[PDB]
Design a protein around this ligand. Structure first.
Ligand SMILES: CC(C)(COP(=O)(O)OP(=O)(O)OC[C@H]1O[C@@H](n2cnc3c(N)ncnc32)[C@H](O)[C@@H]1OP(=O)(O)O)[C@@H](O)C(=O)NCCC(=O)NCCS
Length: 157
């Protein structure tokens, strides 16, 4: 079994470890710290027996909607990074991390939409998001450093 709670400064070391092991976008320590201090209410970790096994790091924005056809200014929640240690996958951790972050984006930060970028090859992640009713709304060409395309996936809150 796992539990969720908001991330704390003392979680950052384990979060970075997870990020280093599971993702190619290896942000520096100060990046994690600033997102925790600025958007901490929507920054969650998953815990198994006192260890962090997953996390979701958000960014809160104000700007043009990426869902609406017309230029329209909205509050947006942006998933910067989400990862779960391999041993603890297929347990619903990412699903519950996203739900918790979404609820805070909506209630704490008045977000009207949530969105993220995902590698077009990232089959597990895409399945996750489509199950949570994210839609592929844009294709960011050459979004990743190696040139790989991203789907911009989004949904209203
Ligand atoms: C994507 C990731 C975060 C999902 O974590 P997770 O805790 O295993 O996800 P969940 O258990 O909540 O998944 C829920 C649903 O998503 C889908 N899904 C998740 N992983 C899948 C896979 N490998 N293949 C097919 N569907 C998958 C399934 O529908 C799953 O439902 P189910 O378990 O009942 O079959 C995880 O695989 C991961 O950390 N990958 C490496 C880092 C990464 O790519 N992060 C996302 C970048 S945008």
């Amino acid at each position: 079994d796992f539990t969720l709670r908001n991330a704390r400064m003392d979680d950052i070391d384990q979060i970075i470890k997870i990020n280093r092991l599971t993702l190619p976008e290896n942000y520096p320590y100060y990046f994690f710290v600033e997102h925790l201090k600025e958007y901490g209410l929507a920054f969650f970790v998953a815990i198994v027996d006192n260890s962090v096994v997953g996390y979701i790091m958000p960014r809160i924005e104000w700007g043009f909607s990426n869902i609406k056809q017309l230029p329209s200014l909205v509050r947006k929640g942006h998933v910067v990074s989400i990862a779960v240690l391999e041993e603890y996958r297929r347990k619903g951790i990412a699903t519950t991390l996203l739900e918790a972050s979404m609820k805070s984006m909506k209630n704490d930060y008045n977000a009207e939409e949530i969105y993220l970028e995902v590698r077009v090859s990232n089959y597990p992640a895409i399945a996750l998001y489509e199950k949570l009713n994210f839609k592929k709304v844009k294709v960011l060409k050459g979004y990743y450093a190696d040139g790989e395309d991203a789907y911009l996936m989004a949904r209203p809150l």
